[PDB]
Amino acid sequence: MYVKLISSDGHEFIVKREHALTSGTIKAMLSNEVNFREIPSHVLSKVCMYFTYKVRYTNSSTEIPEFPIAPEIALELLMAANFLDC
Amino acid sequence: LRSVNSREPSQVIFCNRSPRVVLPVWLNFDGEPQPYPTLPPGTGRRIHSYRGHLWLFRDAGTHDGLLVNQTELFVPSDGQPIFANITLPVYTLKERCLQVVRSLVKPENYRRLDIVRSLYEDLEDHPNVQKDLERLTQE
Amino acid sequence: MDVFLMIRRHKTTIFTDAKESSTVFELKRIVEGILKRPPDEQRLYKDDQLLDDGKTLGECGFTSQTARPQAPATVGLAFRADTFEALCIEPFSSPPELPDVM
Numbered sequence: 395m396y397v398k399l400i401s402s403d404g405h406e407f408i409v410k411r412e413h414a415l416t417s418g419t420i421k422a423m424l425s426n427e428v429n430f431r432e433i434p435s436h437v438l439s440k441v442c443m444y445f446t447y448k449v450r451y452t453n454s455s456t457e458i459p460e461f462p463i464a465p466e467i468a469l470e471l472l473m474a475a476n477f478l479d480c
Numbered sequence: 481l482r483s484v485n486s487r488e489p490s491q492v493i494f495c496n497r498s499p500r501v502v503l504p505v506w507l508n509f510d511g512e513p514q515p516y517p518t519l520p521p522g523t524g525r526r527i528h529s530y531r532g533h534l535w536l537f538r539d540a541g542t543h544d545g546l547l548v549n550q551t552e553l554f555v556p557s558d559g560q561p562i563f564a565n566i567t568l569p570v571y572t573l574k575e576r577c578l579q580v581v582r583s584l585v586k587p588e589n590y591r592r593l594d595i596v597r598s599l600y601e602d603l604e605d606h607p608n609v610q611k612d613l614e615r616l617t618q619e
Numbered sequence: 620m621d622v623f624l625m626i627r628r629h630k631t632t633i634f635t636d637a638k639e640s641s642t643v644f645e646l647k648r649i650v651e652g653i654l655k656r657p658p659d660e661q662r663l664y665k666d667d668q669l670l671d672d673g674k675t676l677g678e679c680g681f682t683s684q685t686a687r688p689q690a691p692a693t694v695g696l697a698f699r700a701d702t703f704e705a706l707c708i709e710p711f712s713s714p715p716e717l718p719d720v721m
């Protein structure tokens with residue numbers, strides 16, 4: 395039901411399985427808990443928002459909002475997004 | 481992959497429910513994309529088009545893809561108008577990140593941001609009608 | 620309405636969603652469900668404000684304008700029954716920055 399994702403700096407992120415299974419990288423790392431030696435909490439907290447965003451709006455007629463990204467985190471997020479395939 | 485030349489008037493409403501400047505794009509009888517005046521973020525516009533004509537919608541500044549009535553291509557199909565609801569898709573987190581990054585940085589300076597070289601080629605692969613028409617023109 | 624929250628305590632952080640009409644005590648069940656710890660023995664806050672078990676989260680001020688999938692609202696969580704610990708939430712890692720862009 396829920397799984398745990400942990401940042402390079404130890405913070406834990408508890409999220410639904412399904413939400414998490416949105417990343418094939420994560421999908422594969424559970425086949426429970428997963429440590430990410432290379433993503434800090436400020437990046438992985440956005441990932442998770444993106445999971446919750448993706449799941450809320452995928453398959454929806456009422457207008458969808460822009461997922462926002464600060465300028466400071468864009469580069470770390472790009473690299474995570476690339477790694478996590480999502 | 482072109483418009484059908486039916487000559488049957490057909491009246492459309494483009495409603496832009498996106499926060500972008502929308503660029504509607506009509507596919508011409510020989511398949512060539514043809515751009516029409518751009519539609520602001522809240523805003524709407526009645527359009528005379530024609531049965532069987534093809535349209536697709538893109539962000540006017542940067543060509544990001546947008547959806548119309550949920551699919552990728554709109555075809556004017558009663559009793560007055562047909563509704564083309566233009567929405568953001570759920571981008572991928574990667575595409576999204578590309579967008580911000582492209583939007584924040586003169587494309588000359590990609591070389592100089594510290595990231596894997598598979599990412600530089602990704603940033604410089606700007607979305608574009610022609611390419612997408614080739615993904616589309618194969619399914 | 621769904622309401623999209625981030626339940627936060629220490630280095631622990633839970634992403635969940637709930638109705639605007641759900642009660643604080645019901646959020647507490649959800650946590651119990653997850654962190655294996657019962658409604659008494661935990662307290663919830665908005666910012667610093669201590670929340671009343673019987674109120675709606677929409678009265679506690681988590682609303683749809685406010686707690687959005689892509690920018691969820693935070694709920695502070697505290698433990699011990701037996702004298703209760705004080706509300707501590709570890710901040711997140713700082714981004715570097717920037718450069719050569721603006």
Ligand SMILES: COC(=O)c1ccc(CNC(=O)[C@@H]2C[C@@H](O)CN2C(=O)Cc2cc(C)no2)cc1
Nearest residue numbers: 485486487506516517525526527528529530533
């Ligand atoms: C603010 O301007 C506009 O958005 C606007 C919108 C539509 C028009 C006139 N209509 C068109 O250009 C349509 C749209 C598309 O169906 C192609 N087109 C044509 O008239 C070309 C054509 C000719 C025949 C015969 N069937 O189609 C002129 C201006």
